Structure formats: structure tokens, C-alpha cells
Subunit: 180 residues, 3 copies
Amino acid sequence: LLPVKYCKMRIFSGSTAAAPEEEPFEVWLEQATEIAKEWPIPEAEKKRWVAESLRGPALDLMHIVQADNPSISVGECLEAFKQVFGSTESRRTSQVKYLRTYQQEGEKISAYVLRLETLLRRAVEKRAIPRNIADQVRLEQVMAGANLGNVLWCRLQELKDQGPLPTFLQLMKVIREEEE
Amino acid sequence: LLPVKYCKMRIFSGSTAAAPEEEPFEVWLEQATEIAKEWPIPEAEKKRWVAESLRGPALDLMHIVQADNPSISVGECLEAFKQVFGSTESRRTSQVKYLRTYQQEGEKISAYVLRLETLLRRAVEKRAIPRNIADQVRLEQVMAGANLGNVLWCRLQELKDQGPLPTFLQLMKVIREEEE
Amino acid sequence: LLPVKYCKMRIFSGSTAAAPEEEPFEVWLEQATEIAKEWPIPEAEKKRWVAESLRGPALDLMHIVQADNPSISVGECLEAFKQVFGSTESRRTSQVKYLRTYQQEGEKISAYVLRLETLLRRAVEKRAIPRNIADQVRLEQVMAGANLGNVLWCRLQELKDQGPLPTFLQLMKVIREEEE
């Protein structure tokens, strides 16, 4: 009889021309694995609740996969989705895509350093960057790739020379304080 | 028979078109209160020595106030002067006139920060600014209101982060050392 | 029967229009004094080995000096060379030639500060600068005489206020780290 808290299913589609409602695949797989492993419901409704989150090309893959094997488990479907849509980067290509990444022509700089920190985690999980130098490659890649103002650059240059280097949180604090 | 030194009387007139010889009223009252309280001679001599420091519109007020009551004391005259010329500012208007005060189009920044400190003392005696944040509002109002850049901005922004904040004297030293 | 690693003789000529192969006189005298004092052979071999390092006007002086006194020692020849080519500076002129020395129109600033330290040593040898202020006159002459801006100016300005002043080596390290 009360109001009820609806909550939005995370939609995925796999098109490059993605709509604003649609996630990157790595986020969708974190939902689909919950439906696969954690929910208690039988496999026939797991399949449906996975399928009801898909749209466009990604839904076509679910149809292809199920039609080519009607006995398939949801776990084996998610292996097919990992194989088609999961990112195939190597140690070489993840270092390159990280180091190639500069501040975009429309970005404010505090968005750039936050965007950049996700690529560092991507590269560290590939073992393409050692954890013990992550701070160095943060400051260096920010200072290489950002459109820095002089008064920020002095404070970043000081911090690079300081001895103990910034956390990502402190680097964001310093950059945010110069966004004005 | 020796040389002799006449330390000059502080002249006041109350006109907006004040001549270079003429004090702000708040300074003249500090002289007139000396002649009122401290000097030993009778009220008739005090009246004349007060009047001899007044000129133009402020002298006209002394004539009005005396003519409407010849029995008046010099102390009671200075209450009339406080009422007509003494600064009428409220708590808000002292903060607003402080925060509105930017570096003038012909000022060097080393003059501006000293001009500005007098307005802070004005606002503190109104209890409009808490004494314990005076240093913050110095650095902030300097950095907001002055025409500085780059090399000086770095040292001031550094000092804002340094822990214990500058005295007015040290802030003046830093700004003067960049006037060159 | 083996390769031999012969090392080039330091040629000197004393012309203002010096060729790229030719040393300044102070470096040549440091070789000629070795041939005078340290080599074992007689004066008649010393004279020839000194003369074989000279060219043009400096060789003409060796001929003049020997012809006007064939009894002369190699040491007394080098006294004639010190008298004709050795620099005749004074406390006044060495301070001026140092403080007048700015960064050249084609120089990198890291080359300029190294050139500048040689002039400081020149001045200290004439007692024209006290050794205990050499650090101040480095930072001040760099900051006055270089072409500078932005992050390096801020770092140099900080270092002037830092307490213990830079060595020349550290001042070079700082300037080189901003040459990029």
C-alpha cells in the first residue's frame, strides 16, 4: 500500500553508438555474474533476467548462443560474452593506451585525472605497471597530458620533488583547488 | 632665541572635495579629544583651540552648535561632530565595503595590502569579522582583489597551505619583494 | 707492432680570431709550465717543445723573445708570455665583467649558469668576491642575468628563501630539470 523503491536494471548493448542508458560491458558483467551465481532462482529464470538486461547486438549474441546450444548454463553464456565483448588488451597495448591518454579539448582537468586513474588500475591488473611506481606515473602522466596552468604546475613540480609522493585523492584535491 | 619647532595643527573641513592638508574626521577627533580632555586651560580656551583646527563646512557646524547653545562644553560639541561626521557603518556594510575593496587602477599591490589592513581593523572593531580568522581574510581578499600573477601567486598560495598563516608584516614583505 | 693512443698537443695562437683547434691562453700556460718544470729533458728540448705548441702571433712572440736574448730560460719565456697574454683584470673590472654577464641570445640557461661559475672563480681568485657570499651572487646573477619565467623562477625564488643556499651542482640540477 506504500510507495515502493524501483531500481534501474543496468542495460547493455555492445554497439559502439551506445545510448546514454547503456553501460560499458565490464559493469554489466558484474550484474550478470550476480544473476548467474548469487540469486537463488532456477536457471530458466536466470536466463530470462540476464536476457532482459540486453539490447541490440548483445541480445543477438544471447539468441545465437542459446539457439546453437539450448542446454547451455548461464555461466557458459557469460564466457561467450567475455569472449565477444571482454577487453583483449596486452601489457604493451595497455601501457600505450595509458601513456597516450591526454586531457580532452572539452575536459576540465579534475575530470581528466579521475579518468586517467581508471586506466592505471586497468594496467596494474594486467601487471603492465608495478604498484610500487603508480604514484610516479600518475604525476608524470598528468604533467605530460594535462593543459596545466603555471600556478598548478609549480605545486605539482614541488610535489614531484617532495620525497613522499601524492595519493590520487591528494592529487585531485590539489587540482580541484585550481579548477576555479 | 634658538630655532623653534611648530609641529603643525591637524586641520579638518568635512568637505568631500578635501584638500591635501586636511585629515579624515576619525584622525581629527583624536586631536580634538586631546584638546577636550587633556589640556589644562578653561572651556573658553578649548573652544577656540578646537575651532582654530576646523575649516569650511566643519567650521560652520561649530558656529551652528555654539550659536544654538553658548553654554555647551567642548565634550558636548564633539558629540555633535561624532553625530554629523563620525562613520555610520553597520556590521554587514563593513564586511561588504571590505570585500568590495580591490586594488586600484593606479596602485602598486604593496600599497593595496596596507590600505586593505585598515579596513580589516575597521570591520574587527565593529565585531563584523572574528579576530581569529583575520589572516585567512587577508590572504583571500588580497588574492581575490589584487592584480598579482604567477610567481607571487605561487608564494601566497604556498603560504595559504603552509600551516601557520602570515602576519600582515610578513605578507607585506613577500608582496614588496615582488614589486621589483 | 700495436695501435698507439697518442693525445693531441694543446695549440695556442693569441689571435682574437682564434681557430676552433686553439685554446685560451690560461689552458695553454698550464701545459707550457709542465714542459718548463716537470719534463726531464734539457732547456734546448724544452724551448722546441714549447715553440711547437705555438702558432701565428703567439709564435712570433717566441721568436722575438729568443732573438732579443738567446740566453733566456723557458721559465723566463713564459714570464714574457704571462706579461703579453695573461689577463690584467682588477677588483673593479672583474666584479663588473661578472655582474654584466647575462645569458647570450642563443644560450640554453643550463649552459649560461656553467659559464657564469667560471667567472665567479675568476673573481674569487682576484679577491673581488668573498667566498662566503658566492652562493648568493650565483642565485642573484642567475635570476638577474638569465632569461627566465614561470616554474623555474618560482623554484629559484623559493631556493633563495630556503635557508641554506644551493651548491652550483644543485643549481645546475634544478635548471637542467626545467630545460625540457
